[PDB]
Amino acid sequence: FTDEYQLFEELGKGAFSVVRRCMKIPTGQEYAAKIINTKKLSARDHQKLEREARICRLLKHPNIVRLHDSISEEGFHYLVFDLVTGGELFEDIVAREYYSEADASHCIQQILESVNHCHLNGIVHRDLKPENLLLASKSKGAAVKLADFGLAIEVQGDQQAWFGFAGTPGYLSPEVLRKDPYGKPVDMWACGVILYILLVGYPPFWDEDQHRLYQ
Amino acid sequence: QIKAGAYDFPSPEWDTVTPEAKDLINKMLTINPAKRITASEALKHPWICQRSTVASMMHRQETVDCLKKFNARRKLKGAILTTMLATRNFSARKQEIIKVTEQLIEAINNGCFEAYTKICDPGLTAFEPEALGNLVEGMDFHRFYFENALSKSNKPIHTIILNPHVHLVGDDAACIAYIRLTQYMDGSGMPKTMQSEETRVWHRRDGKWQNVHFHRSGSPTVP
Numbered sequence: 505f506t507d508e509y510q511l512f513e514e515l516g517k518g519a520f521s522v523v524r525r526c527m528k529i530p531t532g533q534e535y536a537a538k539i540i541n542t543k544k545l546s547a548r549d550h551q552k553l554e555r556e557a558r559i560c561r562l563l564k565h566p567n568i569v570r571l572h573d574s575i576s577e578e579g580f581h582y583l584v585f586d587l588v589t590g591g592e593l594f595e596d597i598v599a600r601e602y603y604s605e606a607d608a609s610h611c612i613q614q615i616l617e618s619v620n621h622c623h624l625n626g627i628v629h630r631d632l633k634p635e636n637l638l639l640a641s642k643s644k645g646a647a648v649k650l651a652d653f654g655l656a657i658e659v660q661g662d663q664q665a666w667f668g669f670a671g672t673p674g675y676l677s678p679e680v681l682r683k684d685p686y687g688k689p690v691d692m693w694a695c696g697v698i699l700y701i702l703l704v705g706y707p708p709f710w711d712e713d714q715h716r717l718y719q
Numbered sequence: 720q721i722k723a724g725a726y727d728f729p730s731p732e733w734d735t736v737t738p739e740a741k742d743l744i745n746k747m748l749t750i751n752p753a754k755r756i757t758a759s760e761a762l763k764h765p766w767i768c769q770r771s772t773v774a775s776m777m778h779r780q781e782t783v784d785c786l787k788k789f790n791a792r793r794k795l796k797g798a799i800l801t802t803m804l805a806t807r808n809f810s811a812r813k814q815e816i817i818k819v820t821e822q823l824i825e826a827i828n829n830g831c832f833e834a835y836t837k838i839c840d841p842g843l844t845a846f847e848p849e850a851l852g853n854l855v856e857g858m859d860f861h862r863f864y865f866e867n868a869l870s871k872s873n874k875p876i877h878t879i880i881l882n883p884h885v886h887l888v889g890d891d892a893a894c895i896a897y898i899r900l901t902q903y904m905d906g907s908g909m910p911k912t913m914q915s916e917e918t919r920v921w922h923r924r925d926g927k928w929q930n931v932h933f934h935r936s937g938s939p940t941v942p
Contacts, residue, residue, distance in 0.1 A: 548866040669836035669858070682925040683837050715842050 505575060505582040511537060520544040525587065535572055538583040542576075552654065557583060559653045562625055567618040569638070569651045590639025590646045597702075608702040611637075611648055615695060618650040623688045631655040632694035633672045634701075659687050673714055674707050681718045724750045732781055739766040739773045805882045813885040816893045816921055819928045823919075824878055824899070827940065830869030832862065840922065840931040847935040868941050876903040876942070891923035899935075903942045913938035 505511075512525040515536060526537040545553065560571035560583075573584040590596060593611060597603055615637065622629055629636075629650065639646040657667045664685040671680060677693035679686040700708040711717040720726070726748060728741055743766050746756040756764070765773045809817065819838065826834035836858055844856050849864075879900035886894040899915040915937040921928045 546867075547871065666833060666837055668833040669841060681841075683927055683929070684925075718841065 505537065505539075505577065507575075509535070509537065509584070511539075520549065526584065534587050536585045536587045538585060540581045540583070542579045542581050555658075556653050556656070559627055559656050559658070560585075563621060563627065563653075565618055565621040566647055567614045567649055568621060569649050586640070586649070588638045588649060588651070589641045590643070592634060593637040593639055593648055594634040594701075596639055605703065608699070611702060612695065612699050614648040615650065615698065618648075619691050619695060622650075622656075623691070626659050626661065627653075628657050628659055628667075628688055629653060629655070629691050629694075630657060630667075631671055631675075632691055632698065633675050634698070637698070662687065673717060674709060676718070722750070724748060732779075735775070735777060735779075737766065737773065737775050739764070740775075743767070806884050809885070810887075812887055812893075815928065816885045816895050817880075817883055819921065819930075820883070820895050820897070820919055821880065823930060824880070827869065828876060828878060830865050832865040835861070835865065838928075838930060840924070840929045843930060844932045845934070847933070848937070848939040849941070864941055872942075874904045874942075876901060878902075893921040893928070895919050895921065899940070901938075901940065901942070905942065911942070913942070915940060 508528060508530060510527045510529050512527065514522060514524050516523045520541055522539045522541075524537050524539065526535045527533060528535065540553070557571060557574055560569070561574070564570060569588060570586045571583060572586070573582070575582050597607075600607075615632075619629070619632070631652070631654075632650075636650060636652045638649050638651050640649050655670050659665070664687045666683070666685050669680060669683075671677075671690070671694075675694040675697050677686065677690040680690060697708060709717055728736070733741070743756075743761065743764050746764075747761065749755040761767060806813075823835070823838045826832075826838065839858065839861075841858065842856065843858065843861075844854055845860070846852075846854060850860065879902070881898035881900055883895055883897040888894060896916070896918045899917050901913050901915070903911055903913070905911045915935050917936075918934040919930050920932040922931050923929070
């Protein structure tokens with residue numbers, strides 16, 4: 505990595521990963537480097553990171569966090585993502601002095617563009633939620649970017665199947681809760697939940713008891 | 720059957736019984752005890768106090784022959800001691816609970832978390848030795864054993880389900896209790912066996928039997 509790029513400040517750190525602002529010195533760029541201490545990565549975690557990188561390499565779209573490079577070293581693998589500075593879309597909205605349906609529609613248009621790109625490439629995100637809707641920068645008109653494909657699956661065309669009970673409760677689809685085979689439409693249900701929230705600021709399904717929520 | 724008063728007088732044997740004898744039976748086998756004939760009243764029933772004119776005097780050989788069998792069975796079933804016999808003649812409904820239970824155990828043995836989360840309710844609770852006397856909720860606690868041991872370890876294991884007992888508690892709810900015998904290879908490569916006792920509560924939701932709670936005692940399922 506240091507080979508070509510250059511590391512800087514830390515933007516975060518997980519259990520096996522540390523993320524830092526980076527720069528491709530040869531081209532004066534600026535990316536986010538996900539530095540993985542491969543010596544701490546388990547076998548099942550190794551299986552999921554291989555899936556997330558393969559999916560991210562396959563998705564090239566303005567409204568999707570782009571994986572720019574993957575390279576290994578001595579027990580330390582590097583993943584170069586786009587640098588995202590604008591934080592959560594939902595956090596930006598509360599700071600705005602004006603916000604209308606037109607603003608919400610412009611947001612959902614971008615989210616739908618990313619979801620459509622995922623689906624067109626046989627990929628289902630399965631965890632669309634506010635935490636995964638980021639703004640590229642703090643610029644006045646920064647682009648909405650879909651992030652974190654750690655729960656994303658690879659589907660065969662339009663074939664439905666049971667890929668497991670995964671997602672965030674408030675955004676889970678009826679078909680997953682019914683334990684039915686499912687596919688791309690689960691993301692569109694989540695979009696509908698997000699759109700509802702973008703208009704009035706509270707969720708369409710909410711309950712202290714999760715069982716009641718799922719009903 | 721008793722609570723429903725579900726008895727009848729099948730032909731042919733009852734075709735030759737007098738109406739008055741059937742009447743007295745009906746008044747004794749009245750579900751509502753407030754409306755049941757009393758001992759004083761029965762002693763005045765025509766079949767009792769006017770037997771000479773009411774009760775038949777025909778010989779009932781088929782009653783004698785049947786009583787012989789009744790008595791013989793009664794003397795064979797005479798339990799001198801408390802005897803507890805397993806269940807082996809299962810309805811289709813009870814077999815359904817056994818099947819989905821074995822599908823769940825199979826998914827655990829094969830480390831198939833997708834099947835596990837399909838069969839188990841998201842709000843599943845559990846008592847198990849792995850949980851050290853705590854009631855655990857959700858899939859998190861169980862996810863650890865799938866993501867690691869259940870597929871990581873490469874050793875042969877054989878599960879046996881002994882003496883399952885199924886309670887049907889409504890059209891969409893059931894309870895199953897069984898002994899879980901597990902044969903496996905230990906660290907030294909020697910064969911071992913362990914036993915657990917397991918209760919699983921099942922609720923039919925969206926047309927699918929789903930496990931909402933289970934209780935394991937004895938050994939922990941991971942060797």
